[PDB]
Design a protein around this ligand. Structure first.
Ligand SMILES: *[C@@H]1O[C@H](CO)[C@@H](O)[C@H](O)[C@H]1NC(C)=O
Ligand SMILES: [Cu+2]
Ligand SMILES: [Cu+2]
Ligand SMILES: [Mg+2]
Ligand SMILES: [Mg+2]
Ligand SMILES: [Mg+2]
Ligand SMILES: [Mg+2]
Ligand SMILES: [O]
Ligand SMILES: [O]
Lengths: 325, 325
């Protein structure tokens, strides 16, 4: 990155952070023009720049050489004994669209001494999607109910040239859609999971105006302020859960891995509240609740798809996403 | 005979008219009749260095007289150091003087001058001797070709004269603004004498240790660099850039100087990339060497031949770096 956890910054330096600055300053690399830092030199702005993603794919491939170095998982590595994913389905169509969102620009303008404010807003078009529900039918043939981790990814089927991807060629392109822990009772049952409850996403933030209104009303009235329903600001926006896709529709693989929750959450309790954004943002003030490597079970090479196809607790199905322009 | 007067006179005579057979009859007699192998008790090494050099001479393996000499040439340096090694083992002045007279007439003049200088500097027998300035012993190495040609013309016409030197280049060449620094004859004597006092070929088996040599190597060259940049600042120029093996050397050079034997010194064009030098190194070898030195610096240790660490996070570290650089 590097962080202050680095055991040896004198030798390994700070590749990623220095690269942000190197790229950010390429419009004035020697300081001759008195230009300020580039958008790459702020986390507020860095993803605006196309080169952000070329830099971060470069970095991602460094990590990938490490994750590719381990032995591929075996059947016995992956099998959650007695747990079968019988079916994966979605209630509701997968549809994306653009809608409108407003925020205030008042803090950006200069206020006169004893002249009144005026409302000044920006209106942006943002991606969004309709709500839907996963229906994951699992058969628990162990003699008792068992905690399970449900891991949900969206994976490409074909590339931009229309070439069908192998699982090994798809896995590093998959995007995480959800991760949750749930007790699976003995027998066959369909687990229902709302898109709105994804542990990858969080809602749009409440406005400054709304926070002022609520705090002022509580302080002025002597009432307690309860903002506990508000989620953290770390997490993919709910509205961006799905890729835009195309008006004509695109097909993707919806990948579901159901893994041993007692093992995955050992030491972190499978009954405890892990918040709304634990997949990538962790749990505020707590250890990370999933002991598995980030990306499990897609983070190792899969040279032989037969291994995954023979694991009953893994299943993928084709879904279609349509963009409504 | 060991008095400072006689030792100084002997050295003066040995260095007089160095490109011709000695014109001093007493040195002529020694060169004809002295046997370096004739009394091993003359030497602190029981005569070994004299045997080594005489074998090279008797096998006709030494560089001919009237030929260019470069201290950076491995074989020519080895030959000069064979004579140094003999002089360095002499117990008494007559051994030193007689070997110098003997080998003056047998060995290349550049090797001989080098060996005699470092022999005087590094032998207690040399104490009290003042070495003549090399710009009068080998004036070609300190005098541009035009002035040498006027000296040749003065000799051809048997007419005494004094000729003005007036710096290389033209006024169109901004680098000429600071030619008075690196072309100053005393600055060049400073530089050659530092390296004679602190030679990279020194081994403590020659008799004593050269304290902090590697750190003094860093410091004397740091000061040459910083002093040159002060002349540039004095003359409305920017500081020098640093060399890079993969980047152009912007500023070329036409020495307009010649060897006594070997021809004119070669010119380097402006704005050239480094090329591999046959028999020396590839440019890429220089980059790898640089990388390995920076690896030691950033590790905080030098790696020994058997792999163990040599700590440089201590005051001697800069000296050890000078040793390896
Ligand atoms: C050489 O320099 C001296 C003193 O600077 C001067 O008197 C003399 O005329 C010069 N000779 C030539 C040929 O310029
Ligand atoms: Cu980054
Ligand atoms: Cu030097
Ligand atoms: Mg959430
Ligand atoms: Mg299998
Ligand atoms: Mg001769
Ligand atoms: Mg080399
Ligand atoms: O980033
Ligand atoms: O970052």
């Amino acid at each position: 990155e590097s962080s202050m956890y680095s055991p040896n910054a004198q030798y390994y330096g700070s590749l990623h952070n220095t690269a942000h600055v190197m790229l950010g300053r390429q419009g004035d690399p020697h300081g001759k023009f008195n230009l300020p830092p580039g958008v790459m030199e702020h986390f507020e702005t860095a993803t605006r720049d196309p080169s952000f993603f070329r830099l971060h794919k470069y970095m991602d491939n460094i990590f990938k050489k490490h994750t590719d170095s381990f032995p591929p998982y075996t059947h016995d590595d992956l099998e959650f004994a007695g747990m079968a994913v019988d079916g994966v389905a979605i209630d509701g169509e997968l549809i994306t669209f653009f809608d409108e969102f407003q925020y205030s620009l008042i803090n950006a303008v200069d206020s006169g001494e004893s002249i009144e404010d005026v409302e000044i807003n920006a209106r942006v078009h943002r991606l969004n999607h309709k709500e839907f529900t996963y229906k994951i039918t699992v058969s628990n043939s162990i003699g008792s109910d068992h905690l399970a981790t449900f891991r949900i990814f969206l994976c490409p089927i074909e590339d931009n040239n229309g070439i069908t991807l192998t699982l090994d060629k798809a896995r590093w392109l998959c995007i995480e859609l959800d991760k949750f822990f749930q007790k699976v009772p003995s027998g066959t049952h369909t687990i229902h999971r709302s898109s709105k409850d994804s542990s990858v996403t969080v809602p749009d933030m409440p406005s400054f105006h709304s926070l002022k209104e609520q705090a002022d009303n509580a302080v002025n009235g002597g009432h307690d302020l309860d903002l506990s329903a508000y989620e953290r600001s770390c997490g993919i926006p709910d509205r961006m859960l799905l890729p835009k896709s195309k008006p004509e529709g695109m097909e993707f693989n919806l990948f579901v891995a159901v893994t041993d929750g007692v093992k995955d959450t050992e030491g972190h309790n499978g009954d405890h509240d892990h918040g709304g954004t634990h997949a990538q943002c962790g749990v505020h003030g707590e250890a990370y609740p999933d002991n598995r490597p980030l990306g499990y079970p897609l983070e190792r090479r899969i040279p032989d798809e037969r291994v995954f196809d023979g694991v009953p607790n893994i299943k993928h199905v084709v879904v279609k996403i349509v963009h409504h322009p | 005979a060991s008095s400072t007067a006689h030792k100084q006179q002997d050295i003066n005579h040995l260095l007089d008219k160095i490109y011709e057979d000695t014109k001093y009859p007493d040195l002529q007699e020694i060169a004809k009749n002295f046997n370096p192998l004739g009394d091993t008790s003359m030497y602190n090494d029981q005569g070994a260095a004299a045997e080594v050099l005489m074998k090279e001479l008797n096998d006709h393996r030494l560089l001919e007289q009237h030929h260019w000499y470069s201290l950076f040439n491995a074989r020519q340096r080895e030959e000069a150091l064979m004579l140094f090694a003999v002089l360095n083992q002499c117990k008494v002045w007559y051994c030193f003087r007689n070997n110098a007279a003997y080998f003056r007439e047998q060995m290349n003049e550049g090797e001989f001058v080098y060996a005699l200088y470092v022999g005087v500097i590094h032998s207690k027998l040399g104490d009290g001797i003042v070495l003549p300035p090399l710009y009068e012993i080998t004036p070609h190495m300190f005098t541009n070709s035009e002035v040498i040609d006027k000296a040749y013309s003065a000799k051809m016409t048997q007419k005494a004269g004094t000729f003005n030197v007036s710096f290389t280049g033209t006024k169109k060449n901004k680098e000429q603004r600071v030619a008075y620094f690196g072309e100053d004859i005393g600055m060049n004597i400073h530089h050659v004498t530092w390296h004679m006092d602190f030679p990279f070929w020194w081994q403590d088996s020659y008799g004593n240790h050269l304290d902090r040599k590697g750190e003094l190597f860093f410091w004397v060259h740091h000061q040459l660099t910083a002093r040159f940049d002060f002349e540039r600042l004095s003359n409305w120029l920017d500081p020098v850039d640093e060399l890079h093996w993969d980047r152009i050397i912007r500023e070329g050079f036409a020495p307009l100087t010649s060897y006594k034997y070997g021809g004119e010194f070669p010119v380097r064009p402006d704005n050239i990339h480094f090329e591999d030098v046959d028999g020396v190194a590839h440019v890429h070898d220089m980059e790898i060497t640089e990388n390995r030195i920076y690896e030691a610096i950033d590790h905080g240790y030098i790696t020994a031949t058997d792999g163990h660490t040599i700590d440089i996070r201590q005051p001697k570290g800069i000296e050890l770096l000078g040793d390896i650089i």
